[PDB]
Amino acid sequence: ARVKRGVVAHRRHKKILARAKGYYGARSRVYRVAFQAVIKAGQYAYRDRRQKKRQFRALWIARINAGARQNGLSYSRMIDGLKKAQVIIDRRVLADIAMHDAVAFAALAEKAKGALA
Amino acid sequence: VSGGGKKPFRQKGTGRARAGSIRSPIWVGGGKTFAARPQDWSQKVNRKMYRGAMQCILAELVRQDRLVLVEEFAVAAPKTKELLAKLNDLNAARALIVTDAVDENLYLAARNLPHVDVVDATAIDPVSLIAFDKVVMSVAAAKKIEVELG
RNA sequence: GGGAAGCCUACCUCAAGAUAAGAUUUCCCUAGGACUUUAUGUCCUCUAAAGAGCCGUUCGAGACUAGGACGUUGAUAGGUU
RNA sequence: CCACAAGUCGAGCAGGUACGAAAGUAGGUCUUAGUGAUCCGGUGGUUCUGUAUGGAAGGGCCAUCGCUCAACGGAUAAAAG
RNA sequence: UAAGUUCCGACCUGCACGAAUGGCAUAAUGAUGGCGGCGCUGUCUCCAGCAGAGGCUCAGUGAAAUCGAAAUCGCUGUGAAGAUGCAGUGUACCCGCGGCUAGACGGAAAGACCCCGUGAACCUUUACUGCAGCUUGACACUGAACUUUGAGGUUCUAACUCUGUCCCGUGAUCCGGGACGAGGACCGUGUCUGGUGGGUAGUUUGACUGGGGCGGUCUCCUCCUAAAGAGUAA
RNA sequence: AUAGCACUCUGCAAACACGAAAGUGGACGUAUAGGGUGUGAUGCCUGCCCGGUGCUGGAAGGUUAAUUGAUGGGGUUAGCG
RNA sequence: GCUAAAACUAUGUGCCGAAGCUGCGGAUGUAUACUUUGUAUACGUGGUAGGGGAGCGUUCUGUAAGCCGAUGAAGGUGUGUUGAGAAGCAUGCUGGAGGUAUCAGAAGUGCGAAUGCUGACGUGAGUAACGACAAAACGGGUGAAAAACCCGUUCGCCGAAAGACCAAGGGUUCCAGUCCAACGUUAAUCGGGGCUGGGUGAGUCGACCCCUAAGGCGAGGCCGAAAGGCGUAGUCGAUGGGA
RNA sequence: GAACCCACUGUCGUUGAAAAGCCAGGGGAUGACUUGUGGAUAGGGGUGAAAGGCUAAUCAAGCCUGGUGAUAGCUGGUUCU
RNA sequence: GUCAAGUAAUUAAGUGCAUGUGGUGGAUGCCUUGGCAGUCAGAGGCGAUGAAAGACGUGAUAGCCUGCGAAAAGCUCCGGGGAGGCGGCAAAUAUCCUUUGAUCCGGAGAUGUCUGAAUGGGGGAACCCACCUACUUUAAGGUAGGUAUUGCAACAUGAAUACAUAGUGUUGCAAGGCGAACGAGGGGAAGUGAAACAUCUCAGUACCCUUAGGAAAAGAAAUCAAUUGAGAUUCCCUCAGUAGCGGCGAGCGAACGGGGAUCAGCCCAUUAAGUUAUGUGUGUUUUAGUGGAACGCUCUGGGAAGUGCGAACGUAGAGGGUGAUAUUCCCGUACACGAAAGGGCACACAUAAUGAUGACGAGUAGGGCGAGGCACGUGAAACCUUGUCUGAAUAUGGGGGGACCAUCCUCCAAGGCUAAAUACUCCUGACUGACCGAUAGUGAACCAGUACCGUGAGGGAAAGGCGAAAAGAACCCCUGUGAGGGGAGUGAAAUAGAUCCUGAAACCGCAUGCAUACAAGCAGUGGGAGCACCUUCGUGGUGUGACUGCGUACCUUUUGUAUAAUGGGUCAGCGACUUAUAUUCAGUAGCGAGGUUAACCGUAUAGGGGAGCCGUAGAGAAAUCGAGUCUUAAUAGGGCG
Ligand SMILES: NCCC[C@H](N)CC(=O)NCCC[C@H](N)CC(=O)NCCC[C@H](N)CC(=O)N[C@@H]1[C@H](O)[C@@H](OC(N)=O)[C@@H](CO)O[C@H]1NC1=N[C@@H]2C(=O)NC[C@@H](O)[C@H]2N1
């Protein structure tokens, strides 16, 4: 019962090389280099699925800060005022409104400073 | 493997990986790492276990209606057509025939038929009892198998 | 306020790839159609400037280059006197 | 107490003793170091075994003897550069 | 010599010369070691010019070691402790050609120095244990006749020796047979046995250890280290 | 290495060497010869030590092998109890 | 970059901040109760050396005289799609004759490393080098093409060898015609290259032959477990003697 | 002092023209000389004017084939979920 | 309109990624006049009448292979067979042969150069040189025969030396050499293990030497046993890893008894069983061969054996081939026949010859000394062999029963022959495989022990595939009458076009789209504008990726590695926990106080075979006892149960 490895081995190598498409030089041509490149790409993706949430929260916070300072408040004071006013709109929606609807954001800031007062 | 007695090159200084023989199993054309030898594949089967398995097989055939009993099963002449018509009458065109003794005419008539074989009552085996579609057994052969108790 | 062969200048050379890409003088190019992707728009016809280079004769310039001079409206090289 | 192999303390029961009038005390010395496994042999004893049988030789069991095996859990009976 | 750790001569507290593992000298000899002088010079101050052969360019043929992959800068710091690749910062448009060797702990050879492995080989000896060789005695081959106080002495021939002479096989410095001569129970050989035996052979020659070696230590008892139960390392 | 020097062994079937032996070299030589060892032309020379190891020659006291097998001690049994 | 701080000390109110906690969706292990269930609840699910459990694919045997296949198998190359994974499924193109469900059974059953083995191909790089510094120039010829071939006219080098012979060694390399892929460190019309055909004439040259040296073998023979060692008579053996 | 036989110095060469050379100098060159042909000595053996030199580019024990897949408490490697 | 300030678009020397289309290369898949392992039955040799192995020749053309040998791809005879043939690479060509029977197949004859045991002498194998007879020739030759050594026999001759013997010669007969494994005998290691090493082990193994047969060896008790029983050798299963041996270490390791396979005894001088030759007869087997059933239509297709519809044979549905997959197309298969001539075996007679120089076993048994063999290493060491020295009794006798003695039991050494059961495979025929399918399987599928390397012994490769059929591309064009290509033609297919099935990867080109010449690092990852093509016109698909957060490969080894510590230039293919036996534990199945057979027989996975093994009882060193037993004076106590 002699077994020849060629078909299965070729299939595995071809799948790895297919996943390595678009990489530079030997990273998309040579099996050893390509295999090292695919594993590292997976590791990076696993880490960056966590990093993405932090990055987008930072972006929302920056935009909310800009809007609040246009309306005469700091970000921390506006967040505190909304908390005291019981508004539970999250930072994603707050930043969206800050970017796309200045009048509504002005109303929100007015509510926050009214609760602060 | 032929040859391979001498050390291919010296242990140190050449820059090659160290080697002891050209017929090393790592080398192309070298020996097989674990060379096979002729093997004996027979197993022991307990006497009672064999008999019980045959009894179970016969009972299962009976309750699945693949065993057909006949008072007598003989052919006048060694004619394949004669045997074929006889089996087509019983609707057992694919069958194993079991008789108390194997008549020469019956054996000759059955030799050329596909899916038909004829055996003595003392020569039944578990694989052949299962492989064929039906088992046509004479009453004398059934009595002999009863005495043997499978 | 004074105060050293030391620092910045001052002297010589390089220097706008200084992408912040600087300044001054002088010179050159001033035509028609079609169409839609209506615009430094895409295709046809016409036009080919001021200059630069290829090539050649060469150099007190030179590894190859680069740089300098000249090409009949001529002394650039060889020869001749 | 302890990996093992080992090591330590011990009331009490029976027999035979010594000293005490007696209740009693005594299974070495106030205690903790003074040591060496296994193999192979020697000596005393033995209601064990005993290669046909009776003996015997040899073996077993109980007590005991032969190590600076001190590199002291001891690779050989026997070994330097 | 201007200047002499070298050289020559002399001195002698010769660490640690010395008479055939020769002592002290010695003409000639030496591609032999050390020191000095004349001449001579690009050896040098200190390099210049020129000639040939490469280098460079063109046409033809066409290697090498190396190589995880590269979009392959400096500095200071950090860090498997000396960074192109990490941090901060400075500088930097893209790509060749001729040169250069400061770094890529550059290439080359599983470090030869050092240590370790109950590794190897060869050599030595008053290491251990065998054997060859040499040597001793007993028994066998191995006999006879006369003397003396188990042993000794004299004589003999017939076993045995001759790498002595003659004869024959035989055209023969081998060998065999025969006849002599000189020896002779010796020598020599077999078995057993004591001695000698680096000639030869197989092996051994401990561990801990602020590397290894040298030194010290290796088992048992007491105190401290030992952190108020036990135990606890150098 | 060498010529020269010295010590020592070797009486011939030589010592010595090769070989298991037969045999061969030494040598178709014979101590003015042959082997081993050291020193190294030549000139002047070459001192003291025999305790150690070795070699050579004595001595027949002590010790010692194979071989030999005098004595003593056991095993067994005819017999006697 | 910072000086009634963006430094230090004390106090207060907010906020940022992790894969920690919460929210939403999904998977999996253990246990309690549902007294089959595959269901709810509670608690768990970082891992080297190791231990335990469950699977995917590959080759072969039976099932299989079955099922799929020239209306196109295996293999190759794309695309789409499915699962937690090893992987599965469908189909376009290529290809041209085999493949094989299910359930069992057996293993030459899975590769990136071992200075691993075999073949192919890269980088260095069109880089170093083209093998004695005795030296070349021109006209004509042939030819697809001439620095190298042929003819001619000049120049230069060796001349105790870079000339002429013999032995040893080699074996057709000798001569003629024809060809230029490979071989020739470049081209080649040329060649010691390919192909085809020729060429070596002995009484006197050499060998053979007669003779022997060193040495070898050796009838009988001597010796040795065997194989064998030595050696007599002889018989070979030139590097020497013989028209 | 040529041929011939050697190998003292230096530059070059070191993926060489060459797995030991070229060039310029150097030593012996009638003798213990150089050299052709054919023989003898074979591996714990041979041979050595002696360096552990040489014995087919190999020598503190040649080469080849077998024991043999020697052993390695050492280093490396060990393949799907 | 000029000027100023601000800010878009526009380059690719080259490069990256994606896609398309190629080259190189030869993986993969499919395949096989090749290997590997067996079963059954044979056979077990060839050679002086010249072997194995070679050299050289031999053809109409003739290089290699095959065959053959100056009679040379063949000659003669007998038998078969019946239309083609002149061997293969390897086509064409010519001369030809053949129904007056060729080629081809089987049997028997003829010829059969040179070397090689090589044998007339020699020698560097395939060469040089001879002698003697008989016939033949006249010139310088031819034909045929003989000429080695050793051993034995006969005859003749014949020294020292008288008789003799040694020696010498002739004739006749025989032997030598080669080759697989198995057998018998003569010698005989070390690596290794003992965690070192010397006894020991490895191991009487490897290797060297001598010599048989189809087998060899052994064999008919001076043997075991221990109720007085068995009854010659050989092989297998148990007994049993037991009893023992052993630096009592590492290890080595029986026997008795039982179960099987096969069975067989016969003689020592008038002499047996048996064996070997030759001849005859009978039977069987083998070497060529002959006959041998039964299919059509239709669809797809280059081609049908494949689809659809019906039919026929079967003592034949084993296998192979034919343009894809055939019981009925071909070769075959089952079955029925067949032999001039030769060979093998079996049985029966005939004659030889052997057995068979030997008639009951003396330098023998036993002993002293040194060794060797027995599972047994000097041990309490019996028994066997003998190098050395000795040495009986002889049936009222002698050997053995594991030191030795007594008693009992048992056998008769110093003389022989003997089949089967057992061991093996160079070779022949048939059949088989959960064996390989060109890096595998033999080193070798192919002109392989070749090319090549080495003085030599010796070492030792790589290399398979057009197509069903060559139908292997007439002719035209470019080019040097080259190579190569474009048309044409053949073919189902030419991107099947000659190193030609398929045709992967590394590596190297061309084309299109986007990005890229002010910006510093494992080259990705999470975001994300623009552009191009497509488009279900989108909250879509494909390609690219300006700008931006984070981010120092993999393996190994380590306390710890981006480490400037190891390994890898890349791809493709290969490459490492196996096999046998024993034992223990766990799952699972059968049976259950029981479970189970081994060798072996068996037309054979069945059925027989109960010897043996495990469990069912412990204690003790043991004798012994036994639900108890050991220790003790103890019924106490205590240990194992
Ligand atoms: N539109 C474009 C048009 C362009 C224009 N037209 C130009 C043009 O078109 N130029 C064409 C150039 C093509 C090329 N240059 C020519 C070429 O190559 N000639 C080759 C000429 C000689 C050729 N070497 C010989 C040959 O083949 N020997 C083989 C060989 O011994 C061996 O084979 C292998 N493998 O080992 C053997 C095994 O079978 O078979 C042989 N042969 C066999 N054949 C047989 C067969 O089939 N059956 C039966 C049997 O006889 C078979 N054996």
mmCIF file of N, CA, C and O (backbone and C1' of nucleotides) and ligand atoms in Angstrom, chain I residues 89-91 465-467 470 472-476 484-489 498-500, ligand 1:
data_model
loop_
_atom_site.group_PDB
_atom_site.id
_atom_site.type_symbol
_atom_site.label_atom_id
_atom_site.label_comp_id
_atom_site.label_asym_id
_atom_site.label_seq_id
_atom_site.Cartn_x
_atom_site.Cartn_y
_atom_site.Cartn_z
ATOM 1 P P C I 89 12.696 -5.148 -36.012
ATOM 2 O "O5'" C I 89 13.895 -4.256 -35.452
ATOM 3 C "C5'" C I 89 13.894 -3.791 -34.110
ATOM 4 C "C4'" C I 89 15.106 -2.943 -33.802
ATOM 5 C "C3'" C I 89 15.329 -1.734 -34.693
ATOM 6 O "O3'" C I 89 14.519 -0.633 -34.322
ATOM 7 C "C1'" C I 89 17.380 -2.881 -34.359
ATOM 8 P P A I 90 14.065 0.452 -35.415
ATOM 9 O "O5'" A I 90 13.163 -0.374 -36.431
ATOM 10 C "C5'" A I 90 12.692 0.218 -37.635
ATOM 11 C "C4'" A I 90 12.912 -0.689 -38.822
ATOM 12 C "C3'" A I 90 12.821 -2.184 -38.523
ATOM 13 O "O3'" A I 90 12.271 -2.859 -39.654
ATOM 14 C "C1'" A I 90 14.962 -1.679 -39.384
ATOM 15 P P A I 91 10.682 -2.879 -39.891
ATOM 16 O "O5'" A I 91 10.398 -1.547 -40.716
ATOM 17 C "C5'" A I 91 9.897 -1.609 -42.042
ATOM 18 C "C4'" A I 91 10.291 -0.392 -42.840
ATOM 19 C "C3'" A I 91 10.513 -0.621 -44.327
ATOM 20 O "O3'" A I 91 9.303 -0.612 -45.063
ATOM 21 C "C1'" A I 91 12.299 0.656 -43.438
ATOM 22 P P G I 465 10.267 7.360 -24.039
ATOM 23 O "O5'" G I 465 8.765 6.840 -23.979
ATOM 24 C "C5'" G I 465 8.307 5.798 -24.834
ATOM 25 C "C4'" G I 465 6.814 5.866 -25.042
ATOM 26 C "C3'" G I 465 6.290 7.208 -25.543
ATOM 27 O "O3'" G I 465 5.212 6.993 -26.447
ATOM 28 C "C1'" G I 465 5.257 6.673 -23.481
ATOM 29 P P C I 466 5.473 7.033 -28.029
ATOM 30 O "O5'" C I 466 4.447 8.120 -28.565
ATOM 31 C "C5'" C I 466 4.554 9.490 -28.209
ATOM 32 C "C4'" C I 466 3.783 10.339 -29.185
ATOM 33 C "C3'" C I 466 2.465 9.735 -29.640
ATOM 34 O "O3'" C I 466 1.406 10.022 -28.749
ATOM 35 C "C1'" C I 466 3.709 10.425 -31.527
ATOM 36 P P G I 467 0.396 8.863 -28.296
ATOM 37 O "O5'" G I 467 -0.406 8.524 -29.624
ATOM 38 C "C5'" G I 467 -1.199 9.516 -30.253
ATOM 39 C "C4'" G I 467 -1.531 9.154 -31.676
ATOM 40 C "C3'" G I 467 -2.135 7.785 -31.913
ATOM 41 O "O3'" G I 467 -3.492 7.681 -31.515
ATOM 42 C "C1'" G I 467 -0.498 8.206 -33.550
ATOM 43 P P A I 470 1.755 1.664 -38.652
ATOM 44 O "O5'" A I 470 1.811 2.750 -39.810
ATOM 45 C "C5'" A I 470 3.044 3.091 -40.423
ATOM 46 C "C4'" A I 470 2.913 4.302 -41.309
ATOM 47 C "C3'" A I 470 4.228 4.794 -41.906
ATOM 48 O "O3'" A I 470 3.970 5.464 -43.142
ATOM 49 C "C1'" A I 470 3.300 6.492 -40.604
ATOM 50 P P G I 472 2.610 10.022 -44.760
ATOM 51 O "O5'" G I 472 3.971 9.365 -44.267
ATOM 52 C "C5'" G I 472 4.212 9.124 -42.885
ATOM 53 C "C4'" G I 472 4.874 10.309 -42.230
ATOM 54 C "C3'" G I 472 6.318 10.580 -42.667
ATOM 55 O "O3'" G I 472 6.522 11.983 -42.816
ATOM 56 C "C1'" G I 472 6.203 10.426 -40.322
ATOM 57 P P A I 473 7.574 12.535 -43.897
ATOM 58 O "O5'" A I 473 6.810 13.742 -44.593
ATOM 59 C "C5'" A I 473 5.646 13.520 -45.373
ATOM 60 C "C4'" A I 473 4.776 14.750 -45.405
ATOM 61 C "C3'" A I 473 5.491 16.048 -45.742
ATOM 62 O "O3'" A I 473 5.621 16.242 -47.139
ATOM 63 C "C1'" A I 473 4.154 16.354 -43.814
ATOM 64 P P A I 474 6.975 16.835 -47.764
ATOM 65 O "O5'" A I 474 6.783 16.668 -49.338
ATOM 66 C "C5'" A I 474 7.050 15.434 -49.988
ATOM 67 C "C4'" A I 474 6.268 15.302 -51.273
ATOM 68 C "C3'" A I 474 6.356 16.477 -52.234
ATOM 69 O "O3'" A I 474 7.521 16.447 -53.042
ATOM 70 C "C1'" A I 474 4.095 15.837 -51.973
ATOM 71 P P C I 475 8.424 17.764 -53.230
ATOM 72 O "O5'" C I 475 7.380 18.912 -53.585
ATOM 73 C "C5'" C I 475 6.810 19.018 -54.881
ATOM 74 C "C4'" C I 475 5.782 20.120 -54.940
ATOM 75 C "C3'" C I 475 6.273 21.502 -54.537
ATOM 76 O "O3'" C I 475 6.945 22.179 -55.584
ATOM 77 C "C1'" C I 475 4.250 21.039 -53.418
ATOM 78 P P C I 476 8.127 23.215 -55.255
ATOM 79 O "O5'" C I 476 7.373 24.494 -54.681
ATOM 80 C "C5'" C I 476 6.518 25.268 -55.507
ATOM 81 C "C4'" C I 476 5.896 26.412 -54.746
ATOM 82 C "C3'" C I 476 6.858 27.333 -54.017
ATOM 83 O "O3'" C I 476 7.463 28.292 -54.865
ATOM 84 C "C1'" C I 476 5.072 26.768 -52.582
ATOM 85 P P G I 484 15.865 22.303 -37.370
ATOM 86 O "O5'" G I 484 15.032 23.654 -37.251
ATOM 87 C "C5'" G I 484 15.048 24.422 -36.057
ATOM 88 C "C4'" G I 484 14.463 25.794 -36.269
ATOM 89 C "C3'" G I 484 13.017 25.846 -36.727
ATOM 90 O "O3'" G I 484 12.085 25.631 -35.685
ATOM 91 C "C1'" G I 484 14.291 27.328 -38.032
ATOM 92 P P G I 485 10.688 24.904 -35.996
ATOM 93 O "O5'" G I 485 9.863 25.972 -36.842
ATOM 94 C "C5'" G I 485 9.339 27.135 -36.224
ATOM 95 C "C4'" G I 485 9.102 28.251 -37.213
ATOM 96 C "C3'" G I 485 7.798 28.216 -37.984
ATOM 97 O "O3'" G I 485 6.703 28.674 -37.213
ATOM 98 C "C1'" G I 485 9.579 28.782 -39.439
ATOM 99 P P G I 486 5.218 28.141 -37.503
ATOM 100 O "O5'" G I 486 4.796 28.887 -38.843
ATOM 101 C "C5'" G I 486 4.700 30.300 -38.888
ATOM 102 C "C4'" G I 486 4.290 30.781 -40.256
ATOM 103 C "C3'" G I 486 3.092 30.089 -40.877
ATOM 104 O "O3'" G I 486 1.859 30.570 -40.376
ATOM 105 C "C1'" G I 486 4.815 30.280 -42.482
ATOM 106 P P G I 487 0.535 29.670 -40.488
ATOM 107 O "O5'" G I 487 0.161 29.744 -42.033
ATOM 108 C "C5'" G I 487 -0.342 28.611 -42.722
ATOM 109 C "C4'" G I 487 -0.220 28.784 -44.214
ATOM 110 C "C3'" G I 487 -0.871 27.706 -45.063
ATOM 111 O "O3'" G I 487 -2.267 27.881 -45.209
ATOM 112 C "C1'" G I 487 1.308 28.100 -45.857
ATOM 113 P P A I 488 -3.264 26.645 -44.976
ATOM 114 O "O5'" A I 488 -2.826 25.579 -46.074
ATOM 115 C "C5'" A I 488 -3.042 25.824 -47.455
ATOM 116 C "C4'" A I 488 -2.421 24.749 -48.308
ATOM 117 C "C3'" A I 488 -2.875 23.328 -48.024
ATOM 118 O "O3'" A I 488 -4.116 23.015 -48.630
ATOM 119 C "C1'" A I 488 -0.523 23.382 -48.187
ATOM 120 P P G I 489 -5.236 22.205 -47.815
ATOM 121 O "O5'" G I 489 -4.647 20.729 -47.710
ATOM 122 C "C5'" G I 489 -4.447 19.942 -48.873
ATOM 123 C "C4'" G I 489 -3.546 18.767 -48.597
ATOM 124 C "C3'" G I 489 -4.017 17.796 -47.529
ATOM 125 O "O3'" G I 489 -4.985 16.877 -48.001
ATOM 126 C "C1'" G I 489 -1.744 18.306 -47.176
ATOM 127 P P A I 498 8.901 18.132 -33.278
ATOM 128 O "O5'" A I 498 9.744 16.864 -32.821
ATOM 129 C "C5'" A I 498 9.215 15.933 -31.883
ATOM 130 C "C4'" A I 498 9.584 14.511 -32.228
ATOM 131 C "C3'" A I 498 11.063 14.263 -32.515
ATOM 132 O "O3'" A I 498 11.426 12.971 -32.036
ATOM 133 C "C1'" A I 498 9.779 13.632 -34.393
ATOM 134 P P U I 499 12.739 12.788 -31.133
ATOM 135 O "O5'" U I 499 12.439 13.656 -29.835
ATOM 136 C "C5'" U I 499 11.363 13.339 -28.958
ATOM 137 C "C4'" U I 499 11.553 13.983 -27.607
ATOM 138 C "C3'" U I 499 12.003 15.441 -27.655
ATOM 139 O "O3'" U I 499 11.507 16.180 -26.534
ATOM 140 C "C1'" U I 499 13.653 14.136 -26.574
ATOM 141 P P C I 500 10.053 15.931 -25.890
ATOM 142 O "O5'" C I 500 9.073 15.639 -27.112
ATOM 143 C "C5'" C I 500 7.925 14.827 -26.917
ATOM 144 C "C4'" C I 500 6.865 15.070 -27.958
ATOM 145 C "C3'" C I 500 5.642 14.171 -27.861
ATOM 146 O "O3'" C I 500 4.682 14.668 -26.943
ATOM 147 C "C1'" C I 500 6.420 14.246 -30.107
HETATM 148 N N1 LIG J 1 2.754 23.478 -41.778
HETATM 149 C C1 LIG J 1 4.213 23.624 -41.665
HETATM 150 C C2 LIG J 1 4.916 23.038 -42.920
HETATM 151 C C3 LIG J 1 6.451 23.286 -42.899
HETATM 152 C C4 LIG J 1 7.186 22.489 -43.984
HETATM 153 N N2 LIG J 1 6.395 21.329 -44.347
HETATM 154 C C5 LIG J 1 8.543 22.030 -43.438
HETATM 155 C C6 LIG J 1 8.431 20.670 -42.704
HETATM 156 O O1 LIG J 1 7.373 20.148 -42.585
HETATM 157 N N3 LIG J 1 9.632 20.015 -42.152
HETATM 158 C C7 LIG J 1 9.476 18.714 -41.460
HETATM 159 C C8 LIG J 1 10.671 18.453 -40.492
HETATM 160 C C9 LIG J 1 10.331 17.339 -39.444
HETATM 161 C C10 LIG J 1 11.589 16.627 -38.911
HETATM 162 N N4 LIG J 1 12.715 17.526 -38.974
HETATM 163 C C11 LIG J 1 11.868 15.388 -39.780
HETATM 164 C C12 LIG J 1 12.317 14.166 -38.931
HETATM 165 O O2 LIG J 1 12.399 14.259 -37.751
HETATM 166 N N5 LIG J 1 12.645 12.883 -39.611
HETATM 167 C C13 LIG J 1 13.072 11.713 -38.851
HETATM 168 C C14 LIG J 1 13.699 10.703 -39.809
HETATM 169 C C15 LIG J 1 14.320 9.490 -39.100
HETATM 170 C C16 LIG J 1 13.686 9.097 -37.750
HETATM 171 N N6 LIG J 1 14.510 9.604 -36.649
HETATM 172 C C17 LIG J 1 13.559 7.570 -37.618
HETATM 173 C C18 LIG J 1 12.584 7.155 -36.528
HETATM 174 O O3 LIG J 1 11.494 7.693 -36.364
HETATM 175 N N7 LIG J 1 13.081 6.110 -35.766
HETATM 176 C C19 LIG J 1 12.349 5.539 -34.658
HETATM 177 C C20 LIG J 1 13.309 5.063 -33.558
HETATM 178 O O4 LIG J 1 14.164 4.048 -34.084
HETATM 179 C C21 LIG J 1 12.508 4.481 -32.395
HETATM 180 O O5 LIG J 1 11.734 5.522 -31.806
HETATM 181 C C22 LIG J 1 12.040 5.849 -30.514
HETATM 182 N N8 LIG J 1 11.171 6.801 -30.041
HETATM 183 O O6 LIG J 1 12.959 5.367 -29.861
HETATM 184 C C23 LIG J 1 11.568 3.383 -32.910
HETATM 185 C C24 LIG J 1 10.679 2.818 -31.808
HETATM 186 O O7 LIG J 1 9.370 2.670 -32.327
HETATM 187 O O8 LIG J 1 10.709 3.894 -33.935
HETATM 188 C C25 LIG J 1 11.399 4.406 -35.080
HETATM 189 N N9 LIG J 1 10.422 4.914 -36.018
HETATM 190 C C26 LIG J 1 9.303 4.248 -36.347
HETATM 191 N N10 LIG J 1 8.360 4.673 -37.181
HETATM 192 C C27 LIG J 1 7.412 3.523 -37.204
HETATM 193 C C28 LIG J 1 5.941 3.649 -37.027
HETATM 194 O O9 LIG J 1 5.315 4.700 -36.940
HETATM 195 N N11 LIG J 1 5.410 2.358 -36.986
HETATM 196 C C29 LIG J 1 6.167 1.083 -37.092
HETATM 197 C C30 LIG J 1 7.688 1.142 -36.810
HETATM 198 O O10 LIG J 1 8.384 1.029 -38.047
HETATM 199 C C31 LIG J 1 7.868 2.495 -36.183
HETATM 200 N N12 LIG J 1 9.134 3.010 -35.755
#
